[PDB]
Structure 1
Amino acid sequence: KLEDVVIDRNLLILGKILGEGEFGSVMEGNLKQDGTSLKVAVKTMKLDNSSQREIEEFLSEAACMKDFSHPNVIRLLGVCIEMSSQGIPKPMVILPFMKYGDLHTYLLYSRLETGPKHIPLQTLLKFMVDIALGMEYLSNRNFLHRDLAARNCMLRDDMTVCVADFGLSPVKWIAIESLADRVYTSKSDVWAFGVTMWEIATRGMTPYPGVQNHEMYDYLLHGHRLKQPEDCLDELYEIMYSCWRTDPLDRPTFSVLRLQLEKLLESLPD
């Protein structure tokens, strides 16, 4: 067994809510860890199946993420498990607290006079370079993100982006084949990465302006894809475009994308 993943619940003090989703919530917290303390980010969830089957499979997956070590992939400190007021297991995943917050909010704030100012092209490409390196590290270990989007990418204290908030087993990030067959592969993550690239290049735009969520599958079925942004370089749009090919076998690997973006940033007068 690898029970380095389970943290004593009495070492954790829960604070103010960062956000409330359908699954769970994200909150500020303090971890005793040594007489000292540490500011952390806590993600609560609510499982099903009272028996070991569901919780052990979740624990195994938690042990996997903890044993990861890369600057562009969020580090998982541990997991506390408490039973809820209804008898349901409530796992609480503990990560380091990210003061600069998510990448999606930072991009929209770069368009406001408070906080960050205009993000130059080179800084936008570095963000993409960072996501691509973290994603490449994940696929070279056969781990599927399942929920890659700009709101799930965090800015570290040195201002390098890491991938976070992985999904387990939003329409506008889901690959065409995954909407019809519900089959999720590495190319479905490549699809989501292309959408994330478009979020960065548009500086926070919601994908497919004008198209409603319920009409997305049919829209993609007709060969429609995200339109090229204003002032977006042609070479850059062709990179994100290659992520959305109808046949997933036509999509490029994460090593090819990372190589493409790094070669483009190095071609600019940075």
Structure 2
Amino acid sequence: VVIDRNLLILGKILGEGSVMEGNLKQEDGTSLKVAVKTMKLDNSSQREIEEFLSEAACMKDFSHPNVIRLLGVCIEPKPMVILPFMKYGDLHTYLLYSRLETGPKHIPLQTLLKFMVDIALGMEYLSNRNFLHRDLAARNCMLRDDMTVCVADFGPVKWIAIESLADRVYTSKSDVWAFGVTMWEIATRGMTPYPGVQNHEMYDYLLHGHRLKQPEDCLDELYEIMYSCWRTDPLDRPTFSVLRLQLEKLLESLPD
């Protein structure tokens, strides 16, 4: 997983650890445009870095068109996660530009659902290998050059599941919760979850049975899938394999 630091040239800041652009000189002699995420670990012990290196070995062997690839790691002693570059950027920002001229056109419902299928397919790939994201959101979903969504940033209380707020436990269904919110952001084209509610009022809001409201133009069939991911009991929540097929079935039922 480790790559020689001399093969990496850094540049601008893309986000703020932090994120940086760069050029990875491959083995075939060609320079590849890549993103570089810094990692602030606790160097008081080799506990965090061990788990970081273990995941890197697995995150590199992954191969799926709806899951971001991991190129390797570079040491300066801070590590740096090397990832592919995405000129189209994240999905959340793309949804905000769509509601503005000059930028993308008004995204139809058919295109919005395709994003959900991709994300679902990405999480379905990780679920089979028992890999948790623990940070699923629209801001984390990047767009490939062929306009296909891919999950990323897998090492925000309104994205965390109710059980993960009390017992602070994280299972596969905890990502289904975040996936449910992700579907809400896409349908709403970049709205912040739970308008009117603060981050410190969430645990009591959800515990009382309240959930994210249904959008104005959102179909009743889609909200049911979105609401099924927010059920109090994680066991009652569906898996990504189910959600993936449900969205595909609803997608094909629509015209072009």
Q: What is the TM-score normalised by the length of structure 2?
A: 0.97
1:193 CA drift (Å): 0.3
- SS of the equivalent of 1:41 reads strand
- Partners of 2:224 and 2:6 lie apart in 1 by 51
Query: How much has 1:91 moved relative to structure 2?
Result: 1.4
Q: CA deviation at 1:50?
A: 4.1
- Structure 1 residues 114-152: Cα deviation after superposition (integer angstroms, max 9, x where no partner): 220100110000000100011111001100111000000
Aligned partner of 2:123 in structure 1 is: 135
Q: CA deviation at 1:174?
A: 0.1
Residue deviations 1:60-94 (CA, integer Å, cap 9, x gap): 11011000000000000001122xxxxxx421000
Distance 2:202 2:228 in 1: 19
SS in 2 for 1:158: coil
Equivalent in 67, 75, 79 of residue 69 of structure 2: 75
**Whole-angstrom CA distance in 2 between matches of 1:112 and 1:102:** 16
In the TM superposition, residue 38 of structure 1 has moved relative to its aligned partner by 1.2
Cα distance in 2, alignment partners of residues 14 and 219 from structure 1 = 44
Comparing 239-248 with 29-38, greater Cα deviation is found at: 29-38
Residues of 2 paired with 1:125 and 1:54: CA distance? Answer: 37
* 2:14 is aligned with 1:18: yes
Aligned residues with identical type, % of pairs: 100
Classify the secondary structure of the residue corresponding to 1:14.
strand
Q: Which ranges in structure 1 are unaligned for 5 or more consecutive residues?
A: 83-88
Distance in 2 between residues matched to 1:186 and 1:61, nearest whole Å: 17
Shift of 1:51: 4.0
Which residue number in structure 2 is paired with residue 86 of structure 1?
A: none
Moved over 6 A (4+): none
Residue by residue over 1:173-213, the C-alpha shift from the partner in whole angstroms, topping out at 9 and shown as x without a partner, is 00000000000000100000000000000011000001011
SS across alignment from 2:66: coil
How far apart are residue 53 of structure 1 and its match?
3.4
* Distance (whole Å) between structure 2 residues aligned to residue 57 and residue 81 of structure 1: 16
Instruction: Give CA-to-partner distance per residue, 1:3-40, whole Å, 9 cap, x none.
Output: xx00001111111011106xxx1111111124331110
Task: Work out the CA distance in 1 between the residues paired with 2:121 and 2:159.
Answer: 19
Structure 1 Cα separation of the partners of residues 25 and 239 of structure 2: 41
Secondary structure of 1:244's partner?
A: coil
User: RMSD of the TM alignment (CA)?
Assistant: 1.1
CA shift for structure 1 position 54: 2.8
